[PDB]
Amino acid sequence: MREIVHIQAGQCGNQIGAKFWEVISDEHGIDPTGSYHGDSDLQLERINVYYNEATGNKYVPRAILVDLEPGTMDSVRSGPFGQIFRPDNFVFGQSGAGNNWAKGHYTEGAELVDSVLDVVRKESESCDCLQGFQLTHSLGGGTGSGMGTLLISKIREEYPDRIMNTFSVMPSPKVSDTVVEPYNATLSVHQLVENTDETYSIDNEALYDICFRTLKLTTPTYGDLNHLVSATMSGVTTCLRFPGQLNADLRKLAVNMVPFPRLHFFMPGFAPLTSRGSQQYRALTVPELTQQMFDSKNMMAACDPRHGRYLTVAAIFRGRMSMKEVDEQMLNVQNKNSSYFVEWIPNNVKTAVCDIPPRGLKMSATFIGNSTAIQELFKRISEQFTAMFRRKAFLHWYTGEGMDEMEFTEAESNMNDLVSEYQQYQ
Amino acid sequence: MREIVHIQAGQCGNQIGAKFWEVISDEHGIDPTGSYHGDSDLQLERINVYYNEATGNKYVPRAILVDLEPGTMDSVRSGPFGQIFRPDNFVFGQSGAGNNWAKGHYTEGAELVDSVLDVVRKESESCDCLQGFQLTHSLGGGTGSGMGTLLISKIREEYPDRIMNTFSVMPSPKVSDTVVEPYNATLSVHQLVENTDETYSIDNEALYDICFRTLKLTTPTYGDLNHLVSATMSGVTTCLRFPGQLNADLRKLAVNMVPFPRLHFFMPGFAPLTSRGSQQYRALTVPELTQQMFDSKNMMAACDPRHGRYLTVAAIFRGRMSMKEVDEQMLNVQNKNSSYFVEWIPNNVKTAVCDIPPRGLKMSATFIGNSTAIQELFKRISEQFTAMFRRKAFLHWYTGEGMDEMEFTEAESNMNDLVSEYQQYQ
Amino acid sequence: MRECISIHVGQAGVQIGNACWELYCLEHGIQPDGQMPSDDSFNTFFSETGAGKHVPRAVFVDLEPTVIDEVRTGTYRQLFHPEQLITGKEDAANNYARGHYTIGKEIIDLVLDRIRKLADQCTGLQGFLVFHSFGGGTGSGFTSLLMERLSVDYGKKSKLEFSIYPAPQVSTAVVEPYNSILTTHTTLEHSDCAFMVDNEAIYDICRRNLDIERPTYTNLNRLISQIVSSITASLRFDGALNVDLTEFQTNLVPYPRIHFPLATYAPVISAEKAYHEQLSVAEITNACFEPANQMVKCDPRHGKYMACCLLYRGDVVPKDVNAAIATIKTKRSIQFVDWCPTGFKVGINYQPPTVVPGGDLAKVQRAVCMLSNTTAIAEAWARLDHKFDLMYAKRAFVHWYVGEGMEEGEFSEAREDMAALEKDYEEVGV
Amino acid sequence: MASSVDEEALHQLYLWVDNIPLSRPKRNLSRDFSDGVLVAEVIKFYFPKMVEMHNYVPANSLQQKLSNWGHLNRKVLKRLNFSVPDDVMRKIAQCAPGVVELVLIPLRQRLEERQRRRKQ
Ligand SMILES: CC(=O)O[C@H]1C(=O)[C@@]2(C)[C@H]([C@H](OC(=O)c3ccccc3)[C@]3(O)C[C@H](OC(=O)[C@H](O)[C@@H](NC(=O)c4ccccc4)c4ccccc4)C(C)=C1C3(C)C)[C@]1(OC(C)=O)CO[C@@H]1C[C@@H]2O
Ligand SMILES: CC(=O)O[C@H]1C(=O)[C@@]2(C)[C@H]([C@H](OC(=O)c3ccccc3)[C@]3(O)C[C@H](OC(=O)[C@H](O)[C@@H](NC(=O)c4ccccc4)c4ccccc4)C(C)=C1C3(C)C)[C@]1(OC(C)=O)CO[C@@H]1C[C@@H]2O
Ligand SMILES: Nc1nc2c(ncn2[C@@H]2O[C@H](COP(=O)(O)OP(=O)(O)OP(=O)(O)O)[C@@H](O)[C@H]2O)c(=O)[nH]1
Ligand SMILES: Nc1nc2c(ncn2[C@@H]2O[C@H](COP(=O)(O)OP(=O)(O)O)[C@@H](O)[C@H]2O)c(=O)[nH]1
Ligand SMILES: Nc1nc2c(ncn2[C@@H]2O[C@H](COP(=O)(O)OP(=O)(O)O)[C@@H](O)[C@H]2O)c(=O)[nH]1
Ligand SMILES: [Mg+2]
């Protein structure tokens, strides 16, 4: 029943996916050993969406862990929930990609794509009614951006009709940790736009901005950014794992949220968000959730929505609430801020409400937005690419892998084409 | 059968009308919950005049409570008889008028006039044979004087033939509690003269004079002034709710009491009035009621009748009495004091007698008088207006509401015209 | 005798069914288990077996299981025939395209199979009461596929249409007008009398009349159920003037294409408010024509009445009905078309309204059901047509409809048809 | 020929509406026309048929004012081939001086246009 098959690519992808697995195992009440320990039967009916039923009433997640290094596999298996995973889905090479997209897409990951495909196919045939694939990866470096796009293309080729949603942490200028990120991002979005039905753009800088300027953490580590990602990870698929008054699965979002086929790079967000010493004072009412939700500080990318127009926004609310105030805020936001939403398309909001709130939360709101302002990251990536493209650096480490100049040129042309379409409707 | 529809405007109006409702509920023997508890059937035949018959033999008064603040509604509903009223006739705004006539007549009360009209119309269609509207309000401030005149004009426009009697407590120099009263009074009487068929002028100072110099109360509160008003409130409509030898309803008074159409601001009064320790000694005979009745101390305005001439006086007596002494006092008063009554109109008195006296009273007398001396309050209001008109104070708080100077000028001109007509026949 | 088969399509249809049958079991006195503790008043809606069990003649069809298998868990899990409540595997994705060609294709054949096995015990089948929502993918596509085959297999039988219609301001999906426009061919060609439901207008109703600040859709349902039961009141209970379901629709319909009447219910009033009013026949008659009581956000004072039907129930005397309608024709603010100086159809039933114990509606000795066609309702479509232009002008979301097997020009036929309907409802007003 | 509008045209227009017999009491025009129901009464004199007065209800809340004016835009103004934006309509409904008069000026001209037209 609407089974969803997860794939992890790169160290970023597999660690954030592992923490997502931890979060939704707590939501479904799954013991670290894999046994069920939840309180209500509501955690139990839609276990088949993320986990496989096995002997002893223990449940194994439908995740395929893919990497080119064994060290990340070693860390994840030794992590808090390493034991719950399938030993077979730990499919990995030995030599790393070295943050080389060409390595992952032609040499290093091409040999392991056969060993990942035979696992993803068995996972899919284990499903009763497959709905799609949620894939976690990073546009930075050559592992997540490199092999991730290749296997995404393969699964899209053999699964042409299933939903393809990807959550992509993507490079940024001021919190860049690797020199050669823009090549990787340009060569990755080239395949992401053509193949993926859904892509969530996540930028690390805005995660940092959330954890300082909203969460007031003095030392928010990398796991806290993983937590911020996993919150929306769990939120976007809430409707098809739990009952709610307005059920909106992934394709419910899709039919409402992407006006033209290529305009599918979106803006995630989550509410509520407070510091430790300020949650005691906050009124968690739904209107306040809304005023927090469309704030430019709550978002997870540097693209400020005030520099563009929203095409479609998705607000999947959660908890035991009525909904007239839901409609009134969703119309007030787009009425008083009608200059920030495309007036030519009147009702830019998709509303979904779930009946069971997250554990420890009385209510929650998950933000998904289509704004023309998201081109801020794309054109900046293209500009940084040009600053390292126009007269030939670092290309020997790609062309040595069989990579060629004209494909780089087409990738840049496609970035320019994308930013053109997203500026067209602004 | 001669149904009469009541409207309350302003805090003064709705509280004095509420105490009137209490008084006549006791007279008709109506339980605080609305059920009937009277002793004789005489209280029961003309219940339709003031109350609506409902299920369970309980009776709801035909009153429309209008205000611009919810606090007065809160007090009246929590008052002694708050529960008997209709929840629907509590029609009210949130922001007050701030004692601004322009606010009530243009901005604050204009939005609520639609919500009062749909209630007054349903109340009128609920009636079998409507006779008129008795409206309680205050000339002071901007709520009672402001919206009261507007809705009076509206009901006069759509009910052109019904009797329009208003009881108006009006500002005074020495017991003034608000700075901007004269503007309100001048802008209110402008509509009162043109629209109302009947207006009873009530002045607070003479109510105080009654409660000290006749009732000998050491601490007569505001509710005691409300009681003094409600006594004549109940008296003026006695004839069409109870049998009597001389039946004189509102239009019976009207045809006898206002010689020219605009000379309809009148002088209320009530007898007997004693202190607690002096009622034990008083002989309540009708001649003594008369000698008390035309006393300048018994009246409820500062206008001393010895400074003018009576045009018409109405003495609606009540109780099991014969009437030859009634005629003999009503002729002796106008014969021995013929210098205080217009000799050019010979019989200035209208006599009405009711058969059932008020509860606890063997007899009672209600005073209604048309004296040219009532211009004392009008010309004094005009003079105080001029002291704050001739060179422009406080007008920014009216002109900011769309109010204009020339309308103030016409209002003052109309006050002068009125005082001219009332001095003409003196 | 006098049986009616109720169809419930989409989440809105199945849940409004859950509320309707909740009302019906109470008013006819059936336990949630289907038994009768202790007249054939139930034969109109419920079938009887040998063991003394009342089995409803209803189908719950949803292309997704969540709401229906929630019904399989609720208090009415045993009331219904389990395999007459049909569930699909893939949701409709708020898309008319898949619901009309792709996903409903494999399930409709079972739906008509169950409809046939519901028809074959109905000896006096009167008509069909299908419930759905315009904006929903299932309620659009599957209903569009279903009335097509019902109109050729049960062409003679009347098909009443109770549909939930989008608000001028309140909306839950951006694709709702797309789903709504392709539904218009079904109501025009394969429906006999359609009843349109607006959520925002009835939101205002419950805000003002019921005094409840925070109702759910369940409160909406526990009044749509009353409106449908009041429409079916004459078929199930005795009355001085019982209106047949065919008599009803003959009185509504002036022309075969003009069959879209508004609905209002009176007295919609809270329990605290029922006490202080006598609640006469006249005021419930006057309250129905008040634009603040309309079920659809359109001003009747903006339009002209063609047919008026007074469906009273409870302790109402027809003389009071005549006295009320004399006043109704007395005022000029309610101007009827020059078609109907007779104006009013009167229907009186002896059963007082049945109150839901968990409901927000008061217990009143009298209830009236107002159903009227008017030209003012075209405004409820006069914003939807301009709305549909505002999306179709770029081909806003058509690649999904194109990708699921819809012809691109079907949108062109759709807005041509709505324009034809809008014109048709304007010439008759002269 | 005056290229622009002078202060005298306002007075001319003020007097003309009084010249028509309109079933209205003594009050300023700039606050009555704001309601909207007066405009259709004005046009009743010219063509009683097109005016229904079974469609707009007199109130004095801005919500009903704008709701009536919007209706009027698409049922009277459209017949006169006359179109106005909502930004303007807001101001008319606010009893804005000058704004509704800017529509009163061409309204009568359009009416006389319809008069001259040989309609069968
Ligand atoms: C005592 C109290 O009220 O504290 C709350 C809490 O509400 C706060 C402090 C929580 C707290 O979260 C954090 O401190 C945090 C730190 C870094 C990154 C993200 C969160 C909380 O830890 C988080 C936790 O939230 C949950 O349990 C949700 O179900 C959440 N799951 C997790 O956060 C989680 C934590 C550890 C392991 C697995 C899951 C979730 C959210 C969306 C979708 C699915 C699950 C709650 C209620 C609290 C604490 C404990 C302090 C917040 O978290 C969430 C996700 O709601 C941070 O801002 C929100 C709201 C509050 O301020
Ligand atoms: C023991 C005794 O004889 O006392 C009498 C009484 O006659 C006196 C003291 C009463 C008394 O009134 C007052 O004390 C009073 C105080 C402030 C303002 C007005 C009155 C009495 O309270 C008032 C009351 O009058 C009535 O009941 C009338 O029906 C009156 N209704 C009310 O006063 C009333 C009081 C409470 C609640 C509801 C109504 C009425 C008058 C005209 C039209 C309709 C109704 C009576 C006979 C008395 C007492 C009890 C002391 C007087 O009242 C009236 C209105 O007749 C004050 O002067 C008169 C005559 C007497 O002096
Ligand atoms: N009045 C009312 N309308 C409802 C209710 N439930 C759903 N709706 C309407 O249904 C519309 C959207 O349709 P959906 O919620 O998707 O339900 P559906 O018909 O099954 O469509 P799909 O989910 O795509 O299969 C909303 O715009 C609502 O107006 C309800 O309980 N009451
Ligand atoms: N938000 C987030 N970003 C990370 C995390 N870990 C690393 N990053 C950054 O994301 C980028 C992704 O590149 P990387 O995954 O190392 O390339 P790969 O090895 O080829 O997959 C790196 O440059 C890191 O700076 C994390 O846990 N959260
Ligand atoms: N006789 C009498 N006068 C009152 C009473 N309450 C207030 N007043 C006076 O009457 C005046 C009326 O003004 P007010 O009603 O407050 O203005 P509004 O709020 O605009 O209606 C006030 O200035 C008070 O001083 C009362 O109970 N009886
Ligand atoms: Mg559905």
Cis peptide bond N-terminal to C168, omega within 30 = no
Annotated binding site of B for GTP: 245, 252
Q: Which residue has the tokens 């002893």?
A: A56
On whether the CB atoms of residues B9 and B143 are closer than 8 A, the answer is yes
Cis peptide bond N-terminal to A243, omega within 30 = no
Same domain as B220, residue B179: yes
| Residue D94 in contact with partner chain B when CB distance is under 8 A | no
On whether the CB atoms of residues B270 and B366 are closer than 8 A, the answer is yes
Q: How far is the CA of B9 from the centre of ligand 5 (A)?
A: 11
| Per-residue buried b or exposed e for A170-190, using 16+ beta carbons within 10 Å of the residue's own CB | bbbeeeeeeebbbbbbbbbbb
Q: How many CB atoms lie within 10 A of CB B97?
A: 26
- Quick check: do B and A touch, 3+ CB pairs under 8 A? no
Distance CA A86, CA A61 (A): 8
Question: In this complex, which chains have at least 3 CB pairs below 8 Å with chain C?
Answer: A, B, D
Same domain as A219, residue A119: yes
- What is the β-pairing status of strands C46-48 and C54-56? antiparallel
Residue A159 sits in a domain whose CATH number is 3.40.50.1440
Q: Report residue C309 as tokens.
A: 């039907």
Ligand 5 atom, smallest distance to B229 CA: 1
| Residue C299 in contact with partner chain D when CB distance is under 8 A | yes
Same domain as B157, residue B203: yes
Helix ranges restricted to H, A203-243:
204-213, 222-236
Planar angle of CA A214, A218, A219, nearest 5 degrees: 115
Spell out the residues 6+ positions from residue B252 whose beta carbon is closer than 8 angstroms to its own. B239, B350, B352
Q: C-alpha B91: how far from its chain's center?
A: 21
Q: 3-class DSSP state for residue B424?
A: helix
Same domain as B310, residue B168: no
Q: How many CB atoms lie within 10 A of CB A329?
A: 22
Distance CA B420, CA B410 (A): 15
Distance CA A375, CA A419 (A): 6
B106: which DSSP letter?
I
Distance CA B73, CA B79 (A): 10
The order of strands in the sheet holding C193-198 is: C85-87, C58-62, C4-9, C127-133, C158-165, C193-198
On whether the CB atoms of residues C135 and C200 are closer than 8 A, the answer is no
> What single-letter amino acid sits at D101?
E
Q: Give bridge partners of residue C193 from the DSSP assignment.
A: C160
Query: DSSP readout, A101-143?
Result: HHIIIIITTTTTHHHHHHHHHHHHHT-SSEEEEEEEEESSTTT
Beta strands in B259-378 (DSSP E): 265-271, 310-319, 349-354, 363-371
Task: Using the Cα atoms of residue A43, residue A46, residue A50 and residue A55 in order, give the sign of their dihedral.
Answer: positive
| Per-residue buried b or exposed e for B13-26, using 16+ beta carbons within 10 Å of the residue's own CB | bbbbbbbbbbbbbb
Note whether B110 contacts D59, CB cutoff 8 Å: no
Q: C-alpha B240: how far from its chain's center?
A: 17
Distance CA A174, CA B158 (A): 74
Note whether B402 contacts D95, CB cutoff 8 Å: yes
| For chain C, domain boundaries | 1-261, 262-376, 377-430
Q: C109 vs A41, B366, C4, C105, C157, CA distance in Å? A: 34, 87, 20, 7, 20
- What is the β-pairing status of strands B363-371 and B310-319? antiparallel
Same domain as A184, residue A51: yes
B358: which DSSP letter?
P
- What is the β-pairing status of strands C305-314 and C366-374? antiparallel
Name the residue of A279, A289, A297, A298 whose CB sits within 8 Å of the most ligand 1 atoms, as the mutation to test its pocket: A279
Tell me if residue C48 is catalytic.
no
Q: Chain C closest CA to D67's CA: distance in Å?
A: 10
Residue B341 sits in a domain whose CATH number is 3.30.1330.20
Same domain as A352, residue A203: no
Residue nearest to atom 1 of ligand 3 (CA): C199
Q: C-alpha A65: how far from its chain's center?
A: 16
On whether the CB atoms of residues C274 and C363 are closer than 8 A, the answer is yes
Q: How many Cβ contacts (< 8 angstroms) between chains B and D?
A: 11
CA gyration radius, chain C? 21
Instruction: Name the residue facing C276 among B53, B60, B122 (closest C-beta).
Output: B60
Residue from C70, C89, C172 whose CB has the most chain A CBs within 10 Å, to mutate: C172
On whether the CB atoms of residues A137 and A144 are closer than 8 A, the answer is yes
Q: A222 vs A6, B10, C288, D104, CA distance in Å? A: 21, 65, 63, 67
Q: How many CB atoms lie within 10 A of CB C168?
A: 16
Residue A312 assigned ligand-binding role: no
Residue B391, Cβ density class (10 Å: 0-12 exposed, 13-18 middle, ≥19 buried): exposed
Q: Which residue has the tokens 């500026």?
A: A423
Spell out the residues 6+ positions from residue B35 whose beta carbon is closer than 8 angstroms to its own. B56, B57, B58, B59
Same domain as B83, residue B6: yes
Distance CA C398, CA C62 (A): 24
Q: Which residues of C touch A349 (CB under 8 A)?
A: 174
Experimental approach was cryo-EM
Distance CA A319, CA B285 (A): 77
Residue B144, Cβ density class (10 Å: 0-12 exposed, 13-18 middle, ≥19 buried): buried
Q: How far is the CA of A279 from the centre of ligand 1 (A)?
A: 11
Same domain as B206, residue B68: yes
Q: Is the CB of B298 under 6 A from ligand 2?
A: no
List the CATH code of the domain at C1-261. 3.40.50.1440
| Residue B158 in contact with partner chain D when CB distance is under 8 A | no
Taking alpha carbons only, the member of B96, B99, B94 closest to residue B397 is B99
Spell out the residues 6+ positions from residue A41 whose beta carbon is closer than 8 angstroms to its own. none
The torsion defined by the Cα of C188, C193, C197 and C201, in degrees rounded to 10, comes to: 100
Residue nearest to atom 4 of ligand 5 (CA): B12
Distance CA B398, CA B389 (A): 13
Distance CA C51, CA C30 (A): 14
Same domain as B403, residue B279: no
Residue A12 assigned ligand-binding role: yes
Distance CA A373, CA A313 (A): 13
Residue A126 assigned ligand-binding role: no
On whether the CB atoms of residues B249 and B257 are closer than 8 A, the answer is no
Phi/psi at A109 (5° precision): -90, -20
Q: Which residues of B touch D34 (CB under 8 A)?
A: none
Same domain as A222, residue A237: yes
Ramachandran area for residue B226 (φ above 0: left; ψ -120 to 50: alpha; else beta): alpha
Same domain as B173, residue B42: yes
Q: Which residue has the tokens 């329009």?
A: B164
Phi/psi at A119 (5° precision): -85, -45
Q: Give bridge partners of residue B199 from the DSSP assignment.
A: B166, B265
The torsion defined by the Cα of A393, A397, A402 and A405, in degrees rounded to 10, comes to: -10
Q: Which residues of B touch D25 (CB under 8 A)?
A: 157
> What single-letter amino acid sits at C164?
I
Residue A331, Cβ density class (10 Å: 0-12 exposed, 13-18 middle, ≥19 buried): middle
Distance CA C181, CA B325 (A): 87
Count CA atoms within 13 Å of residue A369 on its CB side: 32
Q: Chain D closest CA to C337's CA: distance in Å?
A: 11
Q: Which residues of B touch C271 (CB under 8 A)?
A: none
Cis peptide bond N-terminal to C352, omega within 30 = no
Count the domains in chain B.
Answer: 3
Q: Which domain covers residue B137, as residue numbers?
A: 1-259
Q: C279 vs A152, B106, C168, C285, CA distance in Å? A: 68, 35, 32, 10
Distance CA A7, CA A66 (A): 7
Element (H, E) at A315: strand A310-319
On whether the CB atoms of residues B161 and B130 are closer than 8 A, the answer is no
Instruction: Name the residue facing B114 among D25, D59, D95 (closest C-beta).
Output: D59
Q: 3-class DSSP state for residue B261?
A: coil
On whether the CB atoms of residues B199 and B168 are closer than 8 A, the answer is yes
Spell out the residues 6+ positions from residue B294 whose beta carbon is closer than 8 angstroms to its own. B305, B313, B333, B337, B367
Note whether B86 contacts C276, CB cutoff 8 Å: yes
Element (H, E) at B299: none
Query: DSSP readout, A60-86?
Result: EE-EEEEES-HHHHHHHHTSTTGGGS-
Q: How many CB atoms lie within 10 A of CB C280?
A: 15
From the candidates C148, C247, C379, C422, give the one annotated as an active-site residue.
C247
Ligand 4 atom, smallest distance to A16 CA: 27
Q: How far is the CA of A326 from the centre of ligand 1 (A)?
A: 23
Taking alpha carbons only, the member of B167, B115, B157, B129 closest to residue B6 is B167
Taking alpha carbons only, the member of A287, A336, A291, A337 closest to residue A310 is A337
The torsion defined by the Cα of C287, C289, C293 and C297, in degrees rounded to 10, comes to: -170
Q: Is the CB of A365 under 6 A from ligand 1?
A: no
Q: 3-class DSSP state for residue B320?
A: coil
Same domain as B349, residue B386: no
Q: 3-class DSSP state for residue B265?
A: strand
Residue B344, Cβ density class (10 Å: 0-12 exposed, 13-18 middle, ≥19 buried): exposed
| Residue C28 in contact with partner chain D when CB distance is under 8 A | no
Q: 3-class DSSP state for residue B314?
A: strand
Q: Which residues of D touch B157 (CB under 8 A)?
A: 25
* Contact residues of ligand 5, CB 6 A cut-off: B 10-12, 15, 97, 99, 138, 140-144, 169, 177-178, 204, 207, 222, 225-226
3-state SS track over chain C: CCCEEEEEEHHHHHHHHHHHHHHHHHHCCCCCCCECCCCCCCCCCEEECCCCEEEECEEEEECCCHHHHHHCCCCCCCCCCHHHEEECCCCCCCCHHHHHHHCCHHHHHHHHHHHHHHHCCCCCCCEEEEEEECCCHHHHHHHHHHHHHHHHHCCCCEEEEEEEECCCCCCCCCCHHHHHHHHHHHHHHHCCEEEEEEHHHHHHHHHHCCCCCCCCHHHHHHHHHHHHHHHCHHHHCCCCECCCHHHHHHHHCCECCECCCEEEEECCCCHHHHCCCCCCHHHHHHHHCCHHHCCCCCCHHHCCEEEEEEEEEECCCHHHHHHHHHHHHHCCCCCECCCCCCCEEEEEECCCCCCCCCCCCCCCCEEEEEEEEEHHHHHHHHHHHHHHHHHHCCCCCHHHHHHCCCCCCHHHHHHHHHHHHHHHHHHCCC
On whether the CB atoms of residues A51 and A63 are closer than 8 A, the answer is no
Q: Chain C closest CA to B144's CA: distance in Å?
A: 27
Note whether D60 contacts B402, CB cutoff 8 Å: no
Class of domain C377-430: mainly alpha
Q: Which residues of C touch D74 (CB under 8 A)?
A: 382
Q: Report residue A181 as tokens.
A: 């990120």
Q: Which protein residues have their CB within 5 A of the ion that is ligand 6?
A: C 10-11, 138
Element (H, E) at B344: none
Maximal C-alpha separation, chain D: 41
Q: Which residue of B has its CA nearest to D96?
A: B402
Q: Report residue C377 as tokens.
A: 């309702």
On whether the CB atoms of residues A285 and A328 are closer than 8 A, the answer is no
Q: Which residue of A has its CA nearest to C203?
A: A324
Distance CA D84, CA C40 (A): 62
B58: which DSSP letter?
B
Q: A312 vs A252, A272, A417, C173, C180, CA distance in Å? A: 13, 21, 21, 10, 20
- Quick check: do D and B touch, 3+ CB pairs under 8 A? yes
For domain C262-376, say whether CATH 3.40.50.12160 is its number.
Answer: no
